[PDB]
């Protein structure tokens, strides 16, 4: 049993709602909520950008420490991190960028890495200003994450569509 409330039951492990990761993640004080990070960890915009802006921009110094000392990540890689105010952790994820032209196929590389931790509050990967379809990266999710995840979906409208067609 966890504080995860609201949720649609979607399979065995996979759960989603229509909510703010940033009002979820304070609410509920995850062990993990998932970034949607680049491998600058430059978080400036989507979800990346609304996480940092709620942790009064100590996600962002963290991460250019982290980056000095160690470079970027890969794309279809993560790195565990503080959760500042929002969680215990946070795990940066990196999903392929269609707007920057990188293989959808990674997608499938950037779930593997929540079956490290055994539940996690998420976005879904590469969707919104990553330029990927939703509805693929749902599926993908599915297909590859074999831990509890809690997905939350910003776009109402885009709930709704995805819980229709969610086969
Ligand atoms: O990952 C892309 C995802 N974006 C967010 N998800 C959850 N919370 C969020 N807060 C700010 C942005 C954001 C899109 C939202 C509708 C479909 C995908
Ligand atoms: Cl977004």
Redesign the pocket.
Known sequence: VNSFSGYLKLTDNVYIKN????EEAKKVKPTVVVN?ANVYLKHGG??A???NKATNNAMQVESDDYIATNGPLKVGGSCVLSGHNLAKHCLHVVGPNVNKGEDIQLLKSAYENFNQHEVLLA????????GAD?IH?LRVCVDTVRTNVYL????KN??DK?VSSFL
């Open positions: 909510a703010d990761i940033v949607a989507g979800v950008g609304a996480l976005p879904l990967l590469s969707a919104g200003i990553f939703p990266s939350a979906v910003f776009d885009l709930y995805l």
